[PDB]
């Protein structure tokens, strides 16, 4: 989608990582 959210373990294709925001959670901002 087009909304940032904390990815578990790692973000998936389409999402851009922007740091971390939780235990084993990283900031993911998808553009699709």
Boundaries of domain holding 2? 1-32
Experimental method: NMR
Asked whether the beta carbons of 1 and 30 are under 8 A apart, the reply is yes
State the residue for tokens 């925001």: 21
**Pairwise CA distance, residues 14 & 22, whole Å:** 21
Asked whether the beta carbons of 26 and 17 are under 8 A apart, the reply is yes
**Pairwise CA distance, residues 25 & 32, whole Å:** 20
Instruction: Look at the chain and report how many structural domains it folds into.
Output: 1
Closest CA relative to residue 31, chosen from 22, 21, 18, 23: 18
Q: Give, in order, the Cα–Cα distances in Å from 23 to each of 10, 14, 17.
A: 12, 22, 15
Q: How many CB atoms lie within 10 A of CB 28?
A: 21
What does the CA dihedral 10, 14, 19, 20 come to, rounded to 10 degrees? -40
Tokens of 17: 């990582």
**Secondary structure (H, E, C), the chain:** CCCCEEEECCCCCCEEEEEEEECCEEEEEECC
């Amino acid at each position: 989608g087009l909304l940032c959210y904390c990815g578990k373990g790692h973000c998936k294709r389409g999402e851009r990582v922007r740091g971390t925001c939780g235990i084993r959670f990283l900031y993911c901002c998808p553009r699709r």
